[PDB]
Amino acid sequence: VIRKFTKKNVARAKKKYTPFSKRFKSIAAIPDLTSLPEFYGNSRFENKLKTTQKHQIVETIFSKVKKQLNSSYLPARENEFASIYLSAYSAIESDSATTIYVAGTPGVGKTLTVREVVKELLSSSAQREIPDFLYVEINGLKMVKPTDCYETLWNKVSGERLTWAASMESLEFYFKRVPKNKKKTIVVLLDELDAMVTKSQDIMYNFFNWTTYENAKLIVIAVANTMDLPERQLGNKITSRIGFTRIMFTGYTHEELKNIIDLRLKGLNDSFFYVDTKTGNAILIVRKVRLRMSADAIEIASRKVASVSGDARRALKVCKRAAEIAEKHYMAKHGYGYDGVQTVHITHVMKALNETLNSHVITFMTRLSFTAKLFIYALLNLMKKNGSQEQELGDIVDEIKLLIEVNGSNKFVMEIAKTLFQQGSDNISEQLRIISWDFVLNQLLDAGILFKQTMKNDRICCVKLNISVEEAKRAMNEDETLRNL
Amino acid sequence: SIFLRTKALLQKSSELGALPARTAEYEQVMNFLAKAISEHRSDSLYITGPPGTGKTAQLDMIIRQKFLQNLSWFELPDGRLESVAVTSINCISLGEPSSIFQKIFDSFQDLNGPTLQIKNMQHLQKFLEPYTTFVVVLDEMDRLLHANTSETQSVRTILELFLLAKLPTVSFVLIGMANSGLLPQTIVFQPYTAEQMYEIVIQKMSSLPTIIFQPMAIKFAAKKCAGNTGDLRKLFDVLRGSIEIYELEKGKIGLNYIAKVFSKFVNNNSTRTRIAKLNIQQKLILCTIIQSLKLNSDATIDESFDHYIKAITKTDTLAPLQRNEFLEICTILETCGLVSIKKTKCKGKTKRFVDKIDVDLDMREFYDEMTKISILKPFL
Ligand SMILES: Nc1ncnc2c1ncn2[C@@H]1O[C@H](COP(=O)(O)OP(=O)(O)OP(=O)(O)O)[C@@H](O)[C@H]1O
Numbered sequence: 001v002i003r004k005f006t007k008k009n010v011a012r013a014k015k016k017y018t019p020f021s022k023r024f025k026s027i028a029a030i031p032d033l034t035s036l037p038e039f040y041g042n043s044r045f046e047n048k049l050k051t052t053q054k055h056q057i058v059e060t061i062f063s064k065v066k067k068q069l070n071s072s073y074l075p076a077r078e079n080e081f082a083s084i085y086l087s088a089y090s091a092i093e094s095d096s097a098t099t100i101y102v103a104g105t106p107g108v109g110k111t112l113t114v115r116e117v118v119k120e121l122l123s124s125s126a127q128r129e130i131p132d133f134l135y136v137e138i139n140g141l142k143m144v145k146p147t148d149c150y151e152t153l154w155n156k157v158s159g160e161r162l163t164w165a166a167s168m169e170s171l172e173f174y175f176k177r178v179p180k181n182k183k184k185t186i187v188v189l190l191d192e193l194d195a196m197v198t199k200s201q202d203i204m205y206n207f208f209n210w211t212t213y214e215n216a217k218l219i220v221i222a223v224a225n226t227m228d229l230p231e232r233q234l235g236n237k238i239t240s241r242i243g244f245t246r247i248m249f250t251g252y253t254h255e256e257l258k259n260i261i262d263l264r265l266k267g268l269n270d271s272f273f274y275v276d277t278k279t280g281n282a283i284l285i286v287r288k289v290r291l292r293m294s295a296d297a298i299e300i301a302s303r304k305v306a307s308v309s310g311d312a313r314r315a316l317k318v319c320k321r322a323a324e325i326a327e328k329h330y331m332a333k334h335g336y337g338y339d340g341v342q343t344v345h346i347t348h349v350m351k352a353l354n355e356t357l358n359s360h361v362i363t364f365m366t367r368l369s370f371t372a373k374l375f376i377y378a379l380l381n382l383m384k385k386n387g388s389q390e391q392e393l394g395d396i397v398d399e400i401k402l403l404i405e406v407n408g409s410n411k412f413v414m415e416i417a418k419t420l421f422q423q424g425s426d427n428i429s430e431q432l433r434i435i436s437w438d439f440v441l442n443q444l445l446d447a448g449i450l451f452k453q454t455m456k457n458d459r460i461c462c463v464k465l466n467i468s469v470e471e472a473k474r475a476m477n478e479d480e481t482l483r484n485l
Numbered sequence: 486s487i488f489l490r491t492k493a494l495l496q497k498s499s500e501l502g503a504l505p506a507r508t509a510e511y512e513q514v515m516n517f518l519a520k521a522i523s524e525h526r527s528d529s530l531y532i533t534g535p536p537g538t539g540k541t542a543q544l545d546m547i548i549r550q551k552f553l554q555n556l557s558w559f560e561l562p563d564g565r566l567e568s569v570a571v572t573s574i575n576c577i578s579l580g581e582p583s584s585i586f587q588k589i590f591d592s593f594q595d596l597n598g599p600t601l602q603i604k605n606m607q608h609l610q611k612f613l614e615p616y617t618t619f620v621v622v623l624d625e626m627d628r629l630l631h632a633n634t635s636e637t638q639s640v641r642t643i644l645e646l647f648l649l650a651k652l653p654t655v656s657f658v659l660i661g662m663a664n665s666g667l668l669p670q671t672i673v674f675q676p677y678t679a680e681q682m683y684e685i686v687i688q689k690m691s692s693l694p695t696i697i698f699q700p701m702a703i704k705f706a707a708k709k710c711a712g713n714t715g716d717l718r719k720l721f722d723v724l725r726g727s728i729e730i731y732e733l734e735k736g737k738i739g740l741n742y743i744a745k746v747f748s749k750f751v752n753n754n755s756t757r758t759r760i761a762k763l764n765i766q767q768k769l770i771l772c773t774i775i776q777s778l779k780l781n782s783d784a785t786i787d788e789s790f791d792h793y794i795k796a797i798t799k800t801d802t803l804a805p806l807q808r809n810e811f812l813e814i815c816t817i818l819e820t821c822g823l824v825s826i827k828k829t830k831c832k833g834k835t836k837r838f839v840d841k842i843d844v845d846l847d848m849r850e851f852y853d854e855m856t857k858i859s860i861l862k863p864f865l
Pocket residue numbers: 070071072073074075076077104105106107108109110111112113225260312313
């Protein structure tokens with residue numbers, strides 16, 4: 001039979017379709033699910049990235065600082081920790097179902113605090129003072145489909161693999177109908193909650209409505225990026241079910257950021273290493289070299305990061321970048337390779353803070369060819385003349401031609417005009433566009449300096465500056481020929 | 486412990502044949518049930534209200550206390566003990582609205598017997614002829630409309646359910662709960678008042694031996710939760726947070742802990758306090774942003790920086806900044822909470838995505854704070 005089209009790359013997973021409501025013939029037929037060999041959590045890829053180390057790498061004096069300042073390795077979050085821990089501990093011990101809403105800006109320790117809470121709760125459950133529970137982590141930005149959370153959570157509960165709809169009625173049956181004595185408490189971290197927001201808002205309603213069921217024993221800890229998300233994007237039902245209590249994670253102050261960086265720099269700052277002068281490898285306790293990172297540098301970086309974001313990721317990255325600048329200068333000075341006091345100074349911290357601030361756009365426009373600068377000058381002249389933010393390309397052509405033909409008496413124009421309109425050549429006729437006109441137009445379009453509308457007539461097509469006008473003016477009058485005229 | 490058990494009773498999943506403040510609605514639903522089961526007449530009920538007014542709790546109490554799978558007895562005031570089969574279905578947790586008839590069959594037919602495939606209300610209508618009154622309670626039936634299509638196919642499911650609960654010689658009633666002559670009988674659950682909230686809280690806590698609350702604190706919390714649309718869930722969160730703060734900061738707990746709840750979980754940030762934490766340069770850039778949005782109101786970062794440069798060369802206050810430093814101070818104003826930078830399409834002849842400035846601050850206290858600084862009034 002001849003097909004009208006073919007699907008030759010269909011990949012379908014082995015997911016059954018029958019939900020949990022039809023496993024057993026009755027409510028009384030369900031056993032205690034905590035004793036089943038597949039329920040409640042009862043990797044093979046870690047050896048694939050193993051190789052044979054046949055070299056000896058050199059770890060220098062600043063290597064331990066850069067490795068230790070990473071995000072992989074709880075001082076300033078102790079009230080939020082106490083709130084989340086006490087609510088979750090009361091919900092576990094009473095066999096209740098509870099929503100905990102946590103919101104905040106990036107890098108302020110939300111995921112870290114919730115993970116530390118569930119580690120202390122699992123340790124407390126290991127001492128047999130609260131009942132045992134299953135911890136499920138669902139990240140909305142780590143899902144392909146938003147409904148895959150239905151796939152994930154049920155797979156964490158039962159060990160079955162079903163399609164998302166059947167998983168959704170399975171979770172509904174499990175949370176409402178199964179009694180508490182046959183169940184185990186489940187703590188779910190929903191992280192990046194906004195990523196799980198759809199048009200129907202069914203996932204939001206289901207996940208927060210299961211926390212209103214008497215038999216559920218479900219604790220949902222939802223992490224948001226804003227506090228006004230349930231009012232702005234969600235309905236009144238979901239906003240009512242989330243609750244009035246909402247824990248806000250403020251951005252870190254510079255005392256808190258300094259405490260975080262000093263906590264990572266305990267045992268390394270004001271310490272001595274044994275450093276080989278032949279290769280460069282350094283050992284924590286041949287020369288005895290003292291390593292310092294100054295507290296004034298850390299406080300400058302902490303104050304800047306705390307005013308801009310209050311982000312622990314940025315504070316740690318600025319400190320690591322300063323140490324890498326110092327370590328690059330160190331390897332340049334001593335000639336070390338990749339096989340008495342060394343200090344991360346305040347100047348490295350200022351360089352790390354200024355390298356994301358130095359405005360390469362003006363430098364890029366300064367280092368362009370004469371035709372691109374002439375294009376930008378003509379466009380700026382038209383914006384000065386007729387006062388419009390969008391200029392037609394034919395007007396730019398005509399005003400470039402006027403700029404060449406009026407200030408001819410400039411010696412540079414007498415040098416450049418034959419190049420511009422004939423490419424320095426007899427037997428090439430005079431050209432309506434300049435040489436490399438489309439080249440510099442496409443080059444300024446690639447950089448994001450220009451916006452061009454989508455028209456097929458090249459003369460009436462409009463061009464707008466996407467960058468600010470003042471930086472284009474200062475780049476243009478940096479040029480000695482264009483500022484002369 | 487009394488604190489743990491009191492917090493357990495004040496959860497939003499906590500349970501308690503009439504609810505304490507829903508006696509009239511209970512008698513309405515039971516007289517509808519009397520005129521339904523006793524007459525052997527199919528009929529449709531439609532229960533409506535704002536969230537938290539206790540519709541789902543009242544129907545759950547009715548099903549649990551006063552009532553093929555799920556077969557039970559219904560007792561009349563006469564007391565003839567009719568045979569009923571009651572089920573409750575939450576409509577949002579179904580994958581499609583078209584399969585709910587099947588789930589009604591999946592709520593009623595026994596697993597040992599044959600399992601017919603119900604496609605529509607015709608098959609269920611055929612299924613209910615040889616019978617025993619069938620009671621369904623559809624929660625969130627309002628999610629039985631379709632978000633796509635138009636008027637016609639959106640009502641495709643609720644009208645076929647209403648016809649199935651109105652045709653003769655069946656015993657299928659339909660109770661529908663939704664959020665705010667074959668038409669269903671309408672009951673509107675009302676938002677609670679402060680005294681109703683107080684009586685519900687005292688009735689739920691009457692199982693406890695010792696009340697850890699002063700009654701004036703419960704009255705204060707109930708009267709703050711008794712607004713235009715005030716629900717019992719907010720009162721439960723407020724009281725539970727009162728125990729939370731009380732045992733985080735350490736007897737009958739005071740009225741002051743309710744105020745501590747309403748201050749801790751309402752970030753009542755003032756534009757006064759936000760402007761007062763800035764320096765002179767952040768205040769100046771805030772003023773230039775305000776003026777640029779006053780004159781353009783669809784303005785980019787780069788046009789606002791152009792306006793800042795023009796104003797700072799017209800007035801000559803301190804030294805002008807570079808575009809990236811301007812953007813960094815704009816993000817500082819985001820961190821303080823006065824300026825927001827979004828990413829939106831343009832509406833010109835060259836429509837692309839650009840960074841856009843919106844302001845969420847009110848003009849009066851902004852101009853009042855900026856009036857007191859003399860070197861800023863050229864920018865006002
Ligand atoms: N209080 C803290 N003490 C020590 N390190 C911290 C602290 N807060 C944050 N960090 C560091 O910052 C990293 C990022 O924090 P985290 O992942 O918790 O951020 P987040 O607020 O969840 O951000 P996002 O919204 O981007 O997910 C942590 O892994 C850790 O290295």
